[PDB]
Structure 1
Amino acid sequence: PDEWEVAREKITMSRELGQGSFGMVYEGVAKGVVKDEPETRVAIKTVNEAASMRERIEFLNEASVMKEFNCHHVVRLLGVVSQGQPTLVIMELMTRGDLKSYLRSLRPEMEPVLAPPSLSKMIQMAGEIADGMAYLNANKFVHRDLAARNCMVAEDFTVKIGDFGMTRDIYGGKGLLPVRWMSPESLKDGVFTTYSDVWSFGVVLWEIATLAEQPYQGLSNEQVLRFVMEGGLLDKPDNCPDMLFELMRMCWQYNPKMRPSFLEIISSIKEEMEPGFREVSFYYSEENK
């Protein structure tokens, strides 16, 4: 505890956003949580009164992890409020919701105001996710669960990595395993490396290219388990840019050592990102330069 903690009176909840894992996430304003900013619009993660514990510790610790992180492409944590009423945490507001939800919305099936992404807007999207992964791995971190559902999208369309439920250190489990996003080795030996995160990135890229469709439709997790351990692979989406699919296949090399690194992935596309990347991105930063 200590330090990150901030006054409960400095956080006022405006309206509700949506039910979250632990509790209904809200949107509000925080007093003095950002330099040069009197007030800041934020997202309030709360927990239900139900789990008076045996989880409230789990909650605050997932946020404790975020403390270590500080990147443009990784949702920023702007304070926690442990000791007190509803144990909550406040962080950088991502008005547009998770990438999976945002992508689902672009599909015509649910008629609009935004057209599907463009091969360009997809690279920018891939590259942003990758920068954040590149940074996470750089600080000796593994996500273990990288998927569209755990990426947030900001009003200005910036995509960042905003969920660290399974994110542990390179060094029970109430809930299903992200079978469909898991590498072969992860599925086989319970192994998790930066390399597996990459394998998952690939799946994320597939999600983008199919607008967050279900990976391996028809197959059950078990079947996926098998299928993938035998070298199985998802097909090339309909109308997928040759470029994008190539990047997928690269992330799915069976051999964990043959797959590219996040830094490597960024470099293969840096020439196609949007100008402003060169500044804000961790990649071109001096903390890796």
Structure 2
Amino acid sequence: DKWEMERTDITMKHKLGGGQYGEVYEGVWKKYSLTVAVKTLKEVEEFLKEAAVMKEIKHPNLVQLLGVCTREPPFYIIIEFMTYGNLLDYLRECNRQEVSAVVLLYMATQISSAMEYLEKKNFIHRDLAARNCLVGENHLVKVADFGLSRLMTGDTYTAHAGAKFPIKWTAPESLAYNKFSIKSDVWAFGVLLWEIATYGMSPYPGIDPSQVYELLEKDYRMERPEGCPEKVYELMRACWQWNPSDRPSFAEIHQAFETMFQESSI
């Protein structure tokens, strides 16, 4: 297809993100003198399905695919490079006078827009967190999208036996029954909002992941962050409803943040 390109078009550089994303490298697309990111493979079929799914997604707030090398090993997935790294590091290291409350709303609006798109297009993310959001110039935020999966909105995924989850971002039904859906993404988005409001604090601070589920069962939820508007905290708490069906849609979340962002600018 039009996505296929030569490996020789790319000059490979160093591993990006301190190697936290696995085999993702900085690279140069020589034709365009352009810094790109490249995912390589050091299981093959799973990797090739990733490349296939990314061909289908197009949204200003999801990392854009640029090309693939899928004819012969080693395989490449070539994607745009996000200059300011991940949102977690960005928020932790930022000038808070620049990255103010209205900017926090802007970033939340961008992420919910990408998620509304996936919701509409029958996709599920399954690993939403600040570490998996990426930052460009002028507070542009794009959701990392290697592992996106096809799943009709409403339908459920059951994880493989012995699967390990990032517990503090993981919905109760996922933790107990390995069940994932667009509503578990909504839960994770709530934890992401908490990350944003606190400028990259670790969720449930001081609480060992092994004790999180039992807290959630007894109706414990994280406290409202300092300086966080109650209307935003209300959305967080709605995302953390025990029953997946009680949680709002990403369409509703995005509408809420759009309204709030527009009012904050005015």
Could you say which TM-score interval applies, normalised by the shorter chain? 0.7 to 0.9
Distance in 1, matches of 2:15 and 2:209, equals 33
Select between 250-259 and 11-20 the one with higher mean Cα deviation: 11-20
Please give the TM-score of this superposition, normalised by the length of structure 1: 0.79
- Assess if the C-alpha contact under 8 Å between 2:87 and 2:133 holds in 1: yes
SS in structure 2 at match of 1:217 = coil
Q: Secondary structure at the match of 2:180?
A: coil
> Of the candidates 119, 128, 133, which is equivalent to residue 137 of structure 1?
119
2:5 alignment partner in structure 1: 6
Residue pair 2:85, 2:135 contacting (<8 A) in 1 also: yes
Structure 1 alignment gaps of length 5 or more:
32-37, 49-54, 107-112, 276-289
CA, structure 1 residues 175+188, in 2 after alignment: closer, same or farther (shift >3 Å)?
A: closer
Question: Among the aligned pairs, what percent are the same residue?
Answer: 42
Matches of 1:155 and 1:145, distance apart in 2: 24
Is 1:153 the counterpart of 2:147? The answer is no
In proportion to residue count, which structure has more helix? 2
The alignment's C-alpha RMSD in Å is 2.5
Q: Give the match for residue 91 of structure 1.
A: 79
Alignment length (residue pairs): 256
Aligned: 1:208 with 2:196: yes
Take 2:65 and 2:138, find their aligned partners in 1: how far apart are those partners? Answer: 19
Listed as ranges, the gaps of 5+ residues in structure 2 are none
**3-state SS in 1 of match to 2:22:** coil
Question: So what's the TM-score if we normalise by structure 2?
Answer: 0.85
Q: Which residue of 1 aligns with 2:211?
A: 223
CA distance in 2, matches of 1:132, 1:242: 24
| 2:184 paired with 1:186 | no
CA contact (8 A) 1:14 1:29 kept: no
Structure 1 distance, partners of 2:106, 2:188, is 18
| 1:21 aligned residue | 21
Matched, 1:42 2:36: yes
Q: How far apart, CA to CA, are the structure 1 residues paired with 2:46 and 2:21?
A: 12
Q: Does structure 2 conserve the Cα–Cα contact (< 8 Å) formed by 1:180 and 1:224?
A: yes
Shift of 1:58: 2.7
Quick one: which amino acid aligns to residue 179 of structure 1? Answer: I
SS in 2 for 1:204: helix
SS, match of residue 242 in structure 2: coil
The more displaced of 259-268 and 175-184 is 175-184
Offset at residue 57 of structure 1 (A): 3.4
Q: Which residue of 2 aligns with 1:283?
A: none
Moved more, 174-183 or 15-24: 15-24
